A = this chain, B = another copy of it.
């Protein structure tokens, strides 16, 4: 899995430990080994949500499998909860796009996962 969060929250408001927390919680939610989880946080962005520059987050989760209606609801509750608790972003100002990647379309370690 690969997770990115783009946010207008400033860098100083991203707490120490946040990447590690994202890694751990995504491993557990997806079932994937922690070694395969990559996370990326991009603060200080020029963004708006509904026209407003109040705190918001625009995100993507790419995964080989483990994407589907029920799973994605669970991920959204998890990830919105973390963004609310840690970055003080309202859940209704978060979008997360879920992308089910075929293994042949993910490169890693000089090859692909097919």
Q: Which of A24, A37, A81, A112 has the most CB of B within 10 A?
A: A112
A97:B105 contact, CB within 8 angstroms? yes
Q: In whole Å, how far is A69's beta carbon from the nearest beta carbon of chain B?
A: 4
Chain A positions 48 through 71: 1 when the CB is less than 8 Å from some CB of chain B, otherwise 0: 111101001011001000011100
Total chain A interface residues with beta-carbon distance under 8 A: 62
Q: Is A28 an interface residue (CB 8 A)?
A: no
Interface secondary structure of A, over-half rule: mixed
A46:B69 contact, CB within 8 angstroms? no
Task: Please indicate the chain B residues that have their CB under 8 angstroms from the CB of A45 in the complex.
Answer: 40, 42
The residues of A with any CB-CB pair to B shorter than 8 Å are 2, 4, 6, 11, 14, 19-20, 23-24, 34-43, 45-51, 53, 56, 58-59, 62, 67-69, 72-73, 75-77, 79-81, 91-92, 94-101, 104-112, 114
